[PDB]
Amino acid sequence: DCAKEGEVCSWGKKCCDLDNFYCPMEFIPHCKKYKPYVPVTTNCAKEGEVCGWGSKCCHGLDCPLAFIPYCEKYR
Amino acid sequence: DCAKEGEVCSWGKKCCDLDNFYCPMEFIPHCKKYKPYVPVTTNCAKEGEVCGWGSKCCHGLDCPLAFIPYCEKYR
Amino acid sequence: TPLALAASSGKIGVLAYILQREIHEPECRHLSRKFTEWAYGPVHSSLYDLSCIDTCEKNSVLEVIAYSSSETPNRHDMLLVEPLNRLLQDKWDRFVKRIFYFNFFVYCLYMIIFTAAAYYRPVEGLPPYKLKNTVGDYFRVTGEILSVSGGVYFFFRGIQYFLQRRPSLKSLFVDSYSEILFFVQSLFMLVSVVLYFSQRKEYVASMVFSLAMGWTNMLYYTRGFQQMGIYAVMIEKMILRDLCRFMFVYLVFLFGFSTAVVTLIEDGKYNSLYSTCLELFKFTIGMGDLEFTENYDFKAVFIILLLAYVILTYILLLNMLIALMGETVNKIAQESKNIWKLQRAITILDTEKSFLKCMRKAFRSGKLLQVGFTPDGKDDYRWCFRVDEVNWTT
Amino acid sequence: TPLALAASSGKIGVLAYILQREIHEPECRHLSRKFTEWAYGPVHSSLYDLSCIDTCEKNSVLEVIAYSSSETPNRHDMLLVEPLNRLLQDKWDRFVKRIFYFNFFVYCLYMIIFTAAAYYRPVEGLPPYKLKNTVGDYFRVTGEILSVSGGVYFFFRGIQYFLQRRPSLKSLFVDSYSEILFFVQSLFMLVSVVLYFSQRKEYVASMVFSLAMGWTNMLYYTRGFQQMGIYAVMIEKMILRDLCRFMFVYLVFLFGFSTAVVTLIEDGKYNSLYSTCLELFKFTIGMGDLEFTENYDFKAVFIILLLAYVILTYILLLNMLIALMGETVNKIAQESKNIWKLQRAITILDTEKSFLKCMRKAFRSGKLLQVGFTPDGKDDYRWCFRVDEVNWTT
C-alpha cells in the first residue's frame, strides 16, 4: 500500500522504507531519495576566520555564536 | 575545586564526576549518590489490568494514555 | 405597501407610528391599527391588528425585517415597535420552540451517527467497501448511508436558500454566514461520496473536513438563545471583519520574510518556500523554536532577520490583532441583548415556512371584529392579538 | 413585617425611610425610629432603634438582606441605609473580628497538619497502615486523625448549611459558592477515609484532591477584607460566568477536531480519542509542539487541519475568552468597595449564630427609654445604638 519514490506521499499513501524515501513537506510532496552524507568540502572558513557571514565553519570547528563569529577548535 | 558528595553544590562549587554526584535542585542541595537502576518490582499492574490509577504498568508493557488505561504489549 | 417599505428601509418612527396608531374619531376609528380594549393603570390591554404583520401571503412586515440584507441600519425594530416583540414571543413559546429543539436533537443525532460511522471506517483497501453479514458491519453501512443522506439534505436545503432569497455581491457572508457553512459542510461530504465510489483513498480527507465542520456548525443552534448566543456571533465577526482583513497584512510579512529566508540559507527545514512559511508561522504563533544550533553560511544574518521577524510579527502584529479582536468582542457584548432577537426571528420565520400546511398554527390569536362598522359598511373583521402593557403615566 | 419585606425585595428608599424616620409631633414621636439626641454642626449624634434590625428572634433586617439569594437587585443596603453600616462595624471591631482571625488561624493550623500528614505517608503496602511506637510514627497518626476530624467537621457544617437555609434551583452556585467548595473538600476526604480502610491504594487520589482544594479554599478568608477580597470574588465569577459558559463553545471545537484527527490518521499519539483531545488541548493552550516530522498517510491534510485548528482556537477562541474574562475583571474592580461589605455581613451574621449563647455580646449598645412615654402609657424601652454623623447643611 506504499507510495513509491517519486509518487505523491502525504495525501493517499505514505512513503516506503526510510532507507530511501522521505516525504518531504512541500504540499504536493514526492518521495525523494536521500542525498549522500558529504562532509565540509571547499570554500569553507578555516579556524580563526569569520564564520556565519561568508562561509560555513569547517568540520572540526564550531562557529559557534557571536556577532562576528570566528571559528575555534573544541576544548 | 570540586564539592564532595554530601557537600553543598550549586552555590560555591559544582559536584564531582557524574558517576556518583548529581546536585539536585532543592535550593540548598547536597551532592547525592545515584540510586541503583532497579526494574519493576512487585505491586505492579499486569497486562490488561488498570494502570495509571492504582499501580504502575510493568516493565514490558506500556500504560500508555487513556482515561482508564489498560496495559498492553507492544506491537 | 407603505408599511413594508418602512420596514425594508429601517425607519422605526414611521413604523412605530403605523403599528401603534389610535385614531379615535368618527369615520376614523376604522383607520386605526391599535384598539385599546380597556385600561386599568398601569395595565393597558390593547388589541392590535395583523394585516401585513404576520400574514405570509405578501411581503409581511416580519419577513421583510428579518430578510433585510444587513443594510437599513435601523434594524432591531423588534424591541423598538412591539406589537411584534410579543408576536415573535407568542410564535416561539407556542409553536416554534418545540420544533426548534427537535431540529437540534436530530442534528445532534445526525452527528453522533456520522462521528461514529467515521470512527469505525475500514483502513485497508481503497475501493468502495462491501461488508459481510456482521452485527457491527451491517449497523455501520446503515450509519454511512444515513450520514450521506444528511449531506444530501443540507445540500438541497442550501441551494433552496440561495434560490429563494438570492443573496449576492458581498452580502453572502455578512448576512447568511451560517447558512453557507452548512452548505460547505454538505459539499465536503458530496466530494467524499464521489471519491469513495471513485475508488480513491483520499475520500477520508474530504470526510474529515465534513466532520470537523459538522461539529463546529452545531453552534448555529447557540445563536438564538439569550446567554450563549453571543459566542456564535462574535466568532463570525472575528473571522469576517478582524481575521480576514488582517490576513493580508500578515501575509505580506510571512511571504516577505520567507522568501528572504529561503534565498539566504539553502539547507534543510528552509529549503522550500512551503516549509519556511510553516516555520515562520510557528514563530508568530509563539510555538516555534529559536534554536540557532546548526551551522549555516549566513548564520549571523539569519539571526538578525529571525529576531527582526519575531519582534515584528509576534510582538507587534499578533498583539495588534488581539487588540482589534478584543475591541470587537467588547463592542458586541455591550450590544448583546439587541443582537439576540434578530436571530430568533430569522429562525421563527424559517420554521413557519418549513411546514407550509399548518395554517391553523400560522394565525395568531383569532379573528375579531373590533371595528364595529366600516367607513361604508357596518361589518368588519380583523386579527387582533391583544397584549397587556405596563407603562406608567403619573 | 413591612420592614423585612422591604429588605427581602431590594427597596432602598422604602427601607431608608423606615430606619431614618423622625416624626417629631405629639402622639407621633413614639412612632419614630431615629431620635436625634443633640446636633452640633456638622456633628449630629442620633440614637436609633434596633427592634427588628439586629434582634435575631424573628427574621431580622440583617439576616434577610444577607441571606437573600442574589436576586432583589438593590442589594448593598449596608452603605445605602446606615443605621446598620455602623452596626456591622460595631459587631466586627468588638466581637466578630477576634473570632474570625481565630477561625482563620485554626484553618491554617489544620492545613499544616494535613499537608504534613500527607507528605509523610507510607508508600509500600495497600492496607490500612499500622504504626509501631515511633516518635514520628505516633505523631503522624495523630496527624491523620486530626485531618479526618476536620473533614468530618466541614461535612456536617456543610449539611447544616443546606438544611438551615435551603438554597436550590441554580442558586447553589451563584450565591453559596464558597460554602459548597468546603463541602466538596470534605467529601473528597471522606471518600479517602472510605478507600483507606477498604484497603485500596487509590485512597491517596481522593486525598490529594482534598489537599489541593483545601489550600485553595484558604482564600475564602480573603473574602471579607477590603483590598484582597476582590481576588476571591472575581475568581468565582470567571469560573461560573465566563469559563463555564465558554466551555461548551470550546468543547465542540475540541471534540469536533479530535474526532476528525483520529479518523484521519491512525498511528501513535492520536490513536485514541482521549490522547487526541489532550494533544489538541495543548495546542489551544499554547503548550503544544507543531513538529510535523513523522510520516503519516494524510500528512498534508493533517497540517491543514491542525493549522486551521490552531489559528481558530488559539488565536480566536482563547483570546476571545481572555477578552471576556478581562471585562468581568474590570467590571468587578470598579464596583469593588460595594462588593466587599456584603461578604463581611455574611460572616458577621454567621459567627453570631455559631455561639448562640453569648446573648450579652449579641445586643448592641444598651437599652434606653428615649421615647419618654407611649401613645397610651408613660413608660418605654428601646435599644438605641447612637451614631455620630458628619453631613453638611450650609
Added chain:
Amino acid sequence: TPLALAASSGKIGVLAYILQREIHEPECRHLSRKFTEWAYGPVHSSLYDLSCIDTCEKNSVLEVIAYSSSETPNRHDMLLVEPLNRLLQDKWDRFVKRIFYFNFFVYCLYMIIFTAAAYYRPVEGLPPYKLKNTVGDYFRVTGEILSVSGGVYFFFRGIQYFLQRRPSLKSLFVDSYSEILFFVQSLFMLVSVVLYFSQRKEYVASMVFSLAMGWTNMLYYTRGFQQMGIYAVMIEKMILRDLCRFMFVYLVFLFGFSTAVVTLIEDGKYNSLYSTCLELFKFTIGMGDLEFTENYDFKAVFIILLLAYVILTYILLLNMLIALMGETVNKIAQESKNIWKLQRAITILDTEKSFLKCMRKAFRSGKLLQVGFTPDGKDDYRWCFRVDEVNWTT
C-alpha cells in the same frame, strides 16, 4: 498669503471662513469665494472659487495642508472645510485613482521579478556571475537587471523627496515615515550591487534585507484606502512611539541581567555577552527553555536570577508593552475615518506633480465668469468647481 498662512498654521474657522464666504452686496459680490447658483431644498448647488486652492503655481492651499510636518494640530481640514473634500474626491475618481493602481501594479510586478531573481540565484562561486546561453539563464539576468533598476529608481526618487521638501530635525520619522523605508530598501540593494561586483559572497545578505523590506513596503499602498489603511498607520505608531521608547527600558534589563549571568556562570550557552543576550531575549519573548539540568557552580543563584528575570520582564514588562500598544491601537481606530483622508491627499498631490505636463487634467471643472463684473471692470474669470450640498434648515 493669508489663505495659505491659515492653512500652514491649523486654523479651521479662519480657513472655513475664507473658502465659504458669500458677501452678497453691491461692490462686495466680487469679494466672495462661494457663489450659490441655485438652491432647491435641501439641495444647494454652489459654485466655489479655486484661486489658491488647487493652483499649483504658488503654495496652494492643498500643498500646504498636506506637506505640513505633523504640527499645526488642527489638521484634517479636508472634511472640516469642504470646498476641497470634494476637490480631492474629484481628482481621485477621475485622474489619480487610475494612475495609483497602475503604480501599485508595477510595484507588485517589480517584487515578483525581484523575489524570483533572488530565488534562483547561483549558489557556487563568489565572483560576479556570467551566464551562458540558457532560456532560464538569460531570463534571470534580465530579472536581475530589472531589479537593480528598481533600486536605482527608489534611490533617486528618495533623494528627490529629501531635496524638494527638506524634512529635518525629528520630523523625518513622524511625518515622512513611509518614504524613508523605500529609501532604506533602495540602499540595501545598492550595497548589494556594490558587493556583487566586488566579488563578495556577502552580497546576498544585503539583498535579502532588500527583499524582506521590499514586500513589507507593499503595505504603503494599503495606506490610503478606507478599511485597510488603518493597519499601516498603527504599525507605524507602534514602532515609532511604543516600541522605540520602550526599547531603552527593556534594554537596561536585558543588558543588566545578561552581564549578571555571564559573570555568574562561565560555561557554554552563556560564555559570551552576545549569546547570553539571546537566551535572555528568548525568555522574555516566551520562547525559552527554563531547563535547569546542567550543573553549574552558582546554579542555585542562577535559578533565583533567571526566575527574577522571567517574572520581571515576561510578566511585567512584556505585558506592560502590550498594554501600551493596545492603547495606541484602540486610540487610532476610533480616529480612523479622520486618519484616512490625509494619506490620500498626500498621494493625490504627489501623483499630480509626477506628470507636470498634463495641465488639461490639472485644472478642475472649467473656467466660469460668475462675478459678472469687477469692482472697477465689467469682466471677470474664475475656476468654479460647483458642488451640490444636502444640509438642512428646517
Added chain:
Amino acid sequence: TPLALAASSGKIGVLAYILQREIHEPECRHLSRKFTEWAYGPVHSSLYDLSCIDTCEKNSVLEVIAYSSSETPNRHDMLLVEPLNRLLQDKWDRFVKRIFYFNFFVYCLYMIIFTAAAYYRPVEGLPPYKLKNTVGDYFRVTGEILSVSGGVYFFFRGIQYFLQRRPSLKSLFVDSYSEILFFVQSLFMLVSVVLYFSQRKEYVASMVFSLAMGWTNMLYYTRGFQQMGIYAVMIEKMILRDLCRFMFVYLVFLFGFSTAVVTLIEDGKYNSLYSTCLELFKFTIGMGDLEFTENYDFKAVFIILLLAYVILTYILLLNMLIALMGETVNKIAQESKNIWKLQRAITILDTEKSFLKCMRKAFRSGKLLQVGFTPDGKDDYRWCFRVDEVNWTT
C-alpha cells in the same frame, strides 16, 4: 505657619489664595503676595513674593509639598498654584539640569567600571585575589576599588535619607520606593565585600545581584523626564500594588497543587517540594512541557490535576493578573502629565540640598522692594521672581 500647613494637607484653593493674593487698598498692599507690575493684554507680568516658598531656612512650601508621604491627596499643587510651576522650571533650566545630567553621567560611568570589573574577575581561587604587576591586572584592581567605593556612597547616602526624613510604617515603599532600591544595591555589594575578604567563593553571588540591580536602577533617571518617565512609575505600581497583592493569591495555588503533586507521585522531577514548585511555576508561566510520557502510579489522576492546574492558573489567574496590570498601566498613562512634575521637584529639592554652600544660586531672581512702604515703616524688601502670564479676559 498657615502657608505650610495648607501645603502639608493638600489644600489647593487655600494655597492658591495665599500665593496669588492682590489686596490693592491702602494699609493692605503690603499684605499682598502677588504684585502685578504691568499688564498688556493678554500679557500680565506680575512680581510674586518668595518668603516661605523657596526659603530653605524653615519648612519651605516646596520642601513640604515634595516630601509629603503620599497622603494629602490634593497633590500636584505645582501646576495648580503656579508661582512655583515656574520656580521649579527656573531652578531646573538654570542650575539643577546641568548637575542632574552630571550625576547621570557619573552613574553610567560607575556602572561601566563595575560591569567591567566583574566581567574580568579571576575564576580560580577561593581566597581574596592578589594581582601581580600587569597592565590589565592593575587597571582592574582600581576598577574593583572604585566599584566598592560607589557601594559605600549609596550606603551612607541611603542611611542619610532615612535619618533626615524618617519614612516609616508602610510609607517606605509607596513613597521612597526608588531610594531603597539604591540602598538594597549597596548592601548586596557590602555583603559582597565581606564575603570577598572572608575567603568565600560565594561573594560573586552577592555581587551579581548588586550588578543586575545596579543597571535596573539606572531607570531612576528616566523618572523626571516628560516622555520616558512614565515607564519607571508604572513599573513601581505594578510591583507594589499589582504583583505584590496578587502573589498571595497565586502562592496558595502554587503551594496547594505542589503539595498535591508531591504526595501523589513519588519519582524524579517531583520528588521534592522545591522542584515541584518550579515545574508548576513553569506551567503557569507558559514555559512548561505537558509531556505525559513517563509511567507513574496515579498517572491518570496526575493528568487531571495538572490540566486542572493549567486551566486554572495559566488561563484564569495569569490573564486576571494581566488584566489588572493593564488597568494600572492605562490609568497611569492618562494621568501622565500630572505624574511627571512631582518627581522633578523631588530631584530639584534634593540637588539644592546637596551643595548647601552655593547660596548665590539658591536665591531666585533678586531682591526688590516692591511694597514701597510698610504698615508702619516706609521701607521694605522682598524676593520678587516675576512671571509673565497669557490668560485671557475677553
